[PDB]
């Protein structure tokens, strides 16, 4: 029950470290403006969650940068608005510009001093390098959907990570999986018997945003509203332990 009991943290990226909700809102705004500005942020995010999760199941080996153009098309068609294939492909390129949460770089730099840092992310490797540059830290391992050939919450993603962490000198019990998404991360993490830390980025925001409603709310061993609060809790453990 202590953060210091773990040798490594594994992180989801998009939603936990990178603010993908703000990033996709910006990437979609020319399209959503054709619908109308009355359509709310939550409606946009949930419509994207629906098409993204379904397309990730349909074509699990498609690189994320090539999958999001299809999601853009599905949304435009659902909303009945004109669009172009060029706009679709540009949207898939927009991921590299999705911004970090402002607390993520400093938090990751702090945590690097105490833990090996692992990424488990629904992304392609070419795209992720740009997010990695925004995060300003070296990851001990990056396990991407491209490496896996499937997208979380597929069993294959945790299985792939578990099959490689031995190369880092780690076993599954050494790792605290740290993530925002109940659907993508915490349901599978609990299925795999992982210890888990919920970074509840949407603590003040109604609904699930860009993640799907999970089949159930899974258990979590730790919860914090931000990466900055995770770091403060680690500092508190060292100060008072």
* 63/89 Cα distance (integer angstroms): 12
User: 181-191 burial, b if ≥16 CB within 10 A, otherwise e?
Assistant: bbbbbbbbbbe
CB atoms within 10 A of CB 227: 25
Residue pair 10/119 in contact (Cβ under 8 Å)? The answer is yes
* Cβ within 8 Å of residue 96, ≥6 positions away: 127, 130, 131
* Cβ within 8 Å of residue 218, ≥6 positions away: 182, 186, 187, 189, 190, 196
* 90/69 Cα distance (integer angstroms): 8
User: Which segments within 27-179 are labelled E, that is strand?
Assistant: 116-121, 141-144, 175-179
Catalytic one among 12, 19, 124, 140? 12
CA 24 → CA 9, 42, 70, 101, 157, distances in Å?
Answer: 26, 12, 14, 14, 23
Cis, bond preceding 219 (omega within 30 deg of 0) = no
Structural determination approach: X-ray
* 56/230 Cα distance (integer angstroms): 30
3-state secondary structure of 117: strand
DSSP 175-202: EEEEES-IIIIIHHHHHTT-EEEEE-TT
Residue pair 171/165 in contact (Cβ under 8 Å)? The answer is yes
Hey, what are 240's tokens?
């008072």
Q: Is 140 a catalytic residue?
A: no
Hey, what are 204's tokens?
């003040």
| End-to-end Cα distance, the chain | 12
Going by C-alpha positions, the residue among 138, 127, 131 that lies closest to residue 62 is: 127
């Amino acid at each position: 029950m202590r953060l210091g009991d773990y040798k490594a943290l594994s992180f989801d990226c998009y939603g936990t470290l990178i603010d993908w909700e703000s990033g996709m809102i910006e990437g979609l705004r020319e399209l959503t403006a054709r619908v109308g500005t009355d359509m709310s942020r939550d409606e946009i995010l949930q419509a994207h969650a629906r098409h993204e999760s379904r397309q990730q199941a349909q074509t699990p080996g498609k690189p994320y940068r090539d999958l999001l153009p299809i999601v853009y098309k599905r949304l435009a068609e659902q909303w009945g608005v004109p669009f172009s294939q060029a706009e679709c492909e540009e949207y898939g390129r927009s991921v590299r510009n999705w911004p970090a949460f402002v607390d993520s770089p400093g938090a990751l730099q702090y945590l690097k001093k105490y833990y090996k840092l692992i990424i488990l992310s629904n992304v392609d490797n070419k795209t992720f390098q740009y997010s990695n540059e925004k995060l300003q830290v070296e990851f001990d391992a990056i396990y991407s959907a491209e490496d896996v050939g499937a997208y979380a919450p597929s069993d294959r993603n945790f299985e792939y990570m578990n099959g490689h962490i031995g190369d880092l000198g780690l076993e599954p019990g050494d790792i605290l999986h740290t993530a925002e998404s109940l659907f993508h991360d915490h349901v599978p993490a609990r299925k795999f018997g992982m210890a888990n830390c919920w970074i509840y980025r949407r603590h003040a925001q109604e609904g699930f945003g860009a993640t799907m409603t999970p089949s159930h709310e899974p258990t979590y061993d730790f919860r914090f509203n931000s990466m900055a609060d995770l770091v403060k809790a680690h500092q508190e453990e060292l100060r008072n332990g």
